[PDB]
Amino acid sequence: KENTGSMKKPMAKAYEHPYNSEHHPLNFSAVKIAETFHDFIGPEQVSPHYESFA
Amino acid sequence: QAPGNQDKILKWISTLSNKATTGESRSYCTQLSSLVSFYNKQHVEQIPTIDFNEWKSVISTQGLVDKVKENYESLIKEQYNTDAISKQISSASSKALDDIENELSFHAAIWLNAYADYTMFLFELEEYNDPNDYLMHENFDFFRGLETELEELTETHNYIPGAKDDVNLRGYLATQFAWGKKVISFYRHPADDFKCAKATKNMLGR
Amino acid sequence: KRLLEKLNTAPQNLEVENILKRYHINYTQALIDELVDWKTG
Amino acid sequence: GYKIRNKSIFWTRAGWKNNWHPKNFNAPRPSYGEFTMGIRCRNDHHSFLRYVQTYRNMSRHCKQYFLGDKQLEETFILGLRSLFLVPYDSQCLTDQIKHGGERRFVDQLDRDFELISYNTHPYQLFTYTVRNEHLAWKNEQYEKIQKGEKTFEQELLDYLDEQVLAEKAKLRDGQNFSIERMTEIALHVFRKARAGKVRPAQDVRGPDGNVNDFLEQRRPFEHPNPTGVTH
Amino acid sequence: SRIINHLRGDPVYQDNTKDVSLRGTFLRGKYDDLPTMIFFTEACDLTANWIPFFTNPQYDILAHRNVWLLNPRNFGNSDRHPSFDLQEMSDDVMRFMYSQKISMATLGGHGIGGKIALAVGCYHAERVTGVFSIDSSPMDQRYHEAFKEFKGYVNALTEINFKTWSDKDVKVFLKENIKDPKWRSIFTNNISKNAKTQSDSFNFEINYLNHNLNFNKADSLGNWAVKNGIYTGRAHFIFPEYSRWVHLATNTLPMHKVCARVKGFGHDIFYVQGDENPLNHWVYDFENYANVVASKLNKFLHSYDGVHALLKDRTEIGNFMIPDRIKSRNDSKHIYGDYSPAHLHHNWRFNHIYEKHDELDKKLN
Amino acid sequence: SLHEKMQTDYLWVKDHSQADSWAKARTHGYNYIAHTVPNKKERYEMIWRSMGKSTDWELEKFRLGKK
Amino acid sequence: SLHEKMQTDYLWVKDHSQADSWAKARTHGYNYIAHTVPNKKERYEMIWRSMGKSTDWELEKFRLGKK
Ligand SMILES: CCCCCCCCCCCCCCCCCC(=O)OC[C@H](COP(=O)([O-])OCC(O)COP(=O)([O-])OC[C@@H](COC(=O)CCCCCCCCCCCCCCCCC)OC(=O)CCCCCCCCCCCCCCCCC)OC(=O)CCCCCCCCCCCCCCCCC
Ligand SMILES: CCCCCCCCCCCCCCCCCC(=O)OC[C@H](COP(=O)([O-])OCC(O)COP(=O)([O-])OC[C@@H](COC(=O)CCCCCCCCCCCCCCCCC)OC(=O)CCCCCCCCCCCCCCCCC)OC(=O)CCCCCCCCCCCCCCCCC
Numbered sequence A: 001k002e003n004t005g006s007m008k009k010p011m012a013k014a015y016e017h018p019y020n021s022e023h024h025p026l027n028f029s030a031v032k033i034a035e036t037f038h039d040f041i042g043p044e045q046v047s048p049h050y051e052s053f054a
Numbered sequence B: 001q002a003p004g005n006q007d008k009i010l011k012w013i014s015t016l017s018n019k020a021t022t023g024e025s026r027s028y029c030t031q032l033s034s035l036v037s038f039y040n041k042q043h044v045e046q047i048p049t050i051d052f053n054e055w056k057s058v059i060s061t062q063g064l065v066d067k068v069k070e071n072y073e074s075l076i077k078e079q080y081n082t083d084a085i086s087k088q089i090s091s092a093s094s095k096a097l098d099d100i101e102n103e104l105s106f107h108a109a110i111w112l113n114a115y116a117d118y119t120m121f122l123f124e125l126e127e128y129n130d131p132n133d134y135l136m137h138e139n140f141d142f143f144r145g146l147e148t149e150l151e152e153l154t155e156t157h158n159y160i161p162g163a164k165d166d167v168n169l170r171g172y173l174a175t176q177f178a179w180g181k182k183v184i185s186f187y188r189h190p191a192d193d194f195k196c197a198k199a200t201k202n203m204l205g206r
Numbered sequence C: 001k002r003l004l005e006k007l008n009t010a011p012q013n014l015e016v017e018n019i020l021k022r023y024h025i026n027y028t029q030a031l032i033d034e035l036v037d038w039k040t041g
Numbered sequence D: 001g002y003k004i005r006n007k008s009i010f011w012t013r014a015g016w017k018n019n020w021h022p023k024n025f026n027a028p029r030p031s032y033g034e035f036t037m038g039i040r041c042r043n044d045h046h047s048f049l050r051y052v053q054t055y056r057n058m059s060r061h062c063k064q065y066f067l068g069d070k071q072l073e074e075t076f077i078l079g080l081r082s083l084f085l086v087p088y089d090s091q092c093l094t095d096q097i098k099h100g101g102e103r104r105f106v107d108q109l110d111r112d113f114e115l116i117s118y119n120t121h122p123y124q125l126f127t128y129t130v131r132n133e134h135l136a137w138k139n140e141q142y143e144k145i146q147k148g149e150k151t152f153e154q155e156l157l158d159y160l161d162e163q164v165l166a167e168k169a170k171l172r173d174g175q176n177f178s179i180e181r182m183t184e185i186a187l188h189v190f191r192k193a194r195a196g197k198v199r200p201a202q203d204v205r206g207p208d209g210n211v212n213d214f215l216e217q218r219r220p221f222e223h224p225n226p227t228g229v230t231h
Numbered sequence E: 001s002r003i004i005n006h007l008r009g010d011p012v013y014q015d016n017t018k019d020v021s022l023r024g025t026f027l028r029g030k031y032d033d034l035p036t037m038i039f040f041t042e043a044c045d046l047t048a049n050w051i052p053f054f055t056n057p058q059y060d061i062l063a064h065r066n067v068w069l070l071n072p073r074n075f076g077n078s079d080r081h082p083s084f085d086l087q088e089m090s091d092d093v094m095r096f097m098y099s100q101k102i103s104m105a106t107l108g109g110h111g112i113g114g115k116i117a118l119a120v121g122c123y124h125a126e127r128v129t130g131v132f133s134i135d136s137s138p139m140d141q142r143y144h145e146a147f148k149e150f151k152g153y154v155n156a157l158t159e160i161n162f163k164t165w166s167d168k169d170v171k172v173f174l175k176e177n178i179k180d181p182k183w184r185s186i187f188t189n190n191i192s193k194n195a196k197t198q199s200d201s202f203n204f205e206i207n208y209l210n211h212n213l214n215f216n217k218a219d220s221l222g223n224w225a226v227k228n229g230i231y232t233g234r235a236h237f238i239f240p241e242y243s244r245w246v247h248l249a250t251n252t253l254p255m256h257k258v259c260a261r262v263k264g265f266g267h268d269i270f271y272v273q274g275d276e277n278p279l280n281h282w283v284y285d286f287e288n289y290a291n292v293v294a295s296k297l298n299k300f301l302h303s304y305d306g307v308h309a310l311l312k313d314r315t316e317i318g319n320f321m322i323p324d325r326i327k328s329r330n331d332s333k334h335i336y337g338d339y340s341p342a343h344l345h346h347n348w349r350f351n352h353i354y355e356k357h358d359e360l361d362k363k364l365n
Numbered sequence F, G: 001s002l003h004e005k006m007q008t009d010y011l012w013v014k015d016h017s018q019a020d021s022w023a024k025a026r027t028h029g030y031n032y033i034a035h036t037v038p039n040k041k042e043r044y045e046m047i048w049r050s051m052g053k054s055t056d057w058e059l060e061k062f063r064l065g066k067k
């Protein structure tokens, strides 16, 4: 009886906000500022060497 | 058959009774235990064998010893039909019992959902190690939802740290040695002002 | 309680040593003490 | 693991763990009619009905963008109640708050509804994003079922049902297949399955202490110049 | 018999981490009054294996100190508790020292035991004279291959069910699942049959231990947390030249990072000359490794342990004067100058040697 | 019990007779701190532990007392 | 992920030299030595070990070979 199980068609999509995006989020937080800050200073400049540069 | 066949039945009833705390439940356990002991009572009396030839020879009324034997043997043939009963008890039973069959089944599904929550959390927690080794915006992604709440504090101008947290533990750690040791009041907004003022017969509102 | 509180507070060594002598094996008092304790255990 | 060792961590000048009426010099004092000429106060007795109307608006104004998704309306209701039950179940004695907690929470909820009326509240946007990510995965399953194909979730359910038979077919000495055993069977399958996927590195450190990032390429140097595109 | 005295008791599962008692073997010294040494064996490793090391006339360690071969919680005969917090396990030792009337002791350890020993000096330094660590370092070893194997073996041991499994089923399980000979032998001897042959079990708590290792987080024994702090006293480290646990390249820096008085290689840190062999961790088995460890141990106990920091050796006691910081004494009419720091008797609290000698001093005058 | 038993014991917590005459460090280490050493965080932990033993881990006495 | 390789190469530089591809020229650590670190002597010992493993502890080969 369980093997006879079927599925219902779900909704196609929810509401899509026309003024909110991932790169231009509508609301503000230090999280997005941190994302842009690290894009600016770039990744941790890892030295592959055996000794420091100085 | 006689020995060891009731050991398991005693462990079940014992646990069911131990879980009983209210007097009402304890009473039902007594009724339940009686029926089990009633059904599981063992009968051993050494059913004696009848030697009709012995009684037939020593003394008996003509036709009596034989009439008793033939009639006695006829009833001995009759026996219980265990098959028919075995089916009815297994097919359906006590539609009232179906009430708790579906109650305990939903009750278990509730606490199986919680068991899966705690189980899956400890599963995902395996890949998360050393919070001090992750960047800020990456930790918030592991704890999805904090950035959303942080935006709520910002957009409502609740920029007093720990105002909406019931236990602002971070606020107690910073005030361990502060003058006028105090933490922000619950849900305090930096814009609300409940100040009052009154004029009395005396000066300064006194 | 009082009596309970009060209760709360060589030859075998030679036998084993001679055996170790016959096999001319190095022997130490610690080993002998353990074997002696092993016999009593 | 680690517990706060300072026994006076939750001490305040007002008492233990007091975040409802902090001690301040200008403390509340009573007023006497016979001696009071005039007064300027903003307190009132309108918070109860404002608490009611605020719930009705936040619910009815957020449902405008659910598109009749009944499961979302019910999930949102449970989440909306969690926001209004904060003063009823908190450790904070919301009834002893300095100048009236009732007026305080109501005014705080009104600021939330203001954003909800414009459809700019983060909980709204969080809801739309979370739901779209959910429906996309339910539609992916529906398209695979209509094609007669088996879903990744069913392949595990079927693979787990047989693994249980194999374990209890050999577990004859005992017959108590605990939930703990059932659990570690699935986890052994989840770890194996998750490791099979090409997922981004989540843990800082791999089997070695070294970090699993693209930056953890140290000596020795064995990579040549980068090559260009092929035509 | 006399030299070897191990108190006998039964492990007790404890809900409170403070009601934990430690049990182990005591080795009496040759001489009447000697300071005491508390030594922690490797995890899941037997205390008896170290007896021939501490009872060897060639080394003659007992001539210096009385030795307590002590088992940590969840190990051996000591009480059982799921937590392995080094602060909690360190308080356990302080209660043992109190119950046994030990004012202060010399601490030692092998491998993970060395961490436990050093942790006690970090949390209770005023009552620890020195630390002697063997093939260990105050470092996170969770990702060392040697630790993973130990972490892996303990997990395999959780599969065995003594009730159903037979004696032969166990022996076959160990040989195949445990490749290292020594670990295999260690685990076999840890198996014991309780009274009335009810069933066989491991002397150490396999459940509490596996969770600590398998979880692989800060509370793990392989981990060394910043919470443990710094050890202020004398510390000497000895490890093999080629050791899987302590690599000479970088695993020596944690010693300087955690131990303030460690001078460096050749003074407080030594390596034993040896070949590459995974069994070199067990120095007590190989005479070459042991002879060097013993000599360095006797030197630490004789000249360096329980000596004030600013003094070089025990030779300087009574002839080297330490500078004094100004405004450090309560007396106002005190002419500040150099002084020789006070070194006290090893068990001055639980004896009256000071009260006795004060009387004898008066008789002279 | 054994934990509290030894805490109360005068012998277990007793300064030696000459302890008063000895030179006493009158700081926990918060006056001059090492800021750039790799064991920096480990140093702070020993300051916190020293401040706690002085107050039986009731740091309110430190907040009220004189620094 | 999908755009990981393309993005990671866009953010940072890799070392293009293949200096270590040549075996014998690999350094044992005697070219740039740390002189003041507290593990100074442990570093020299590892340099000595690498020089010995390369010659089966017959350092006459190193003296005759090219540095
Ligand atoms: C016509 C021809 C003219 C052009 C010729 C072309 C060539 C010109 C030269 C260009 C050179 C480019 C390549 C070298 C640049 C970096 C050199 C360097 O030492 O950095 C390595 C060093 C670490 O390298 P590492 O060995 O791999 O160690 C990594 C650890 O993470 C490090 O952290 P750690 O804590 O773990 O380890 C210790 C750390 C210790 O170091 C540190 O952690 C911090 C060092 C202090 C940073 C400076 C703070 C100054 C505050 C701002 C004030 C000045 C701003 C400048 C502008 C002011 C207005 C004019 O680093 C060290 O190992 C030793 C430090 C070596 C000295 C550091 C100070 C160098 C001077 C930097 C400031 C220069 C401007 C002021 C000079 C006077 C201006 C006239 O990084 C830095 O020092 C960063 C500071 C900024 C460096 C770039 C600044 C501009 C270029 C500076 C050239 C220096 C010489 C000239 C000035 C010296 C005058 C006394
Ligand atoms: C027999 C003596 C010949 C001396 C010739 C005159 C001076 C050198 C001219 C050539 C320049 C290159 C020098 C390479 C050898 C380095 C020797 C050295 O510096 O001593 C290191 C040595 C210890 O340091 P080391 O690291 O163990 O030495 C190993 C090397 O570092 C590295 O170890 P390795 O095993 O890998 O290398 C072995 C060594 C083996 O060397 C030999 O076996 C010598 C071969 C016979 C001699 C060939 C050179 C003859 C020059 C005469 C013709 C000169 C014409 C000039 C004008 C007219 C002159 C009248 O070097 C070579 O293999 C040479 C191969 C050249 C490869 C060429 C590849 C193509 C490159 C093309 C571009 C070239 C641009 C170069 C830039 C300009 C150069 C500055 O010190 C001593 O031996 C002490 C005892 C004195 C040795 C006898 C004197 C020999 C000259 C050394 C200076 C003595 C100063 C004494 C005072 C000390 C301070 C108070």
Ligand SMILES: CCCCCCCCCCCCCCCCCC(=O)OC[C@H](COP(=O)([O-])OCC[N+](C)(C)C)OC(=O)CCCCCCCCCCCCCCCCC
Pocket (backbone or CB within 6 Å): B178, B179, B180, B181, D013, D025, F063, F064, F065
């Ligand atoms: C650094 C660059 C930027 C700097 C920006 C300025 C940052 C200032 C940092 C915060 C300073 C906060 C000072 C608050 C002092 C309160 C102390 C206290 O609670 O009293 C407890 C005290 C002491 O109790 P206690 O328990 O808290 O401390 C005890 C102290 N010992 C340990 C010594 C015993 O008791 C009182 O209640 C007396 C209250 C007197 C309050 C007098 C201060 C009034 C000044 C604040 C008003 C200023 C408003 C300015 C607005 C200007 C607008 C234009």
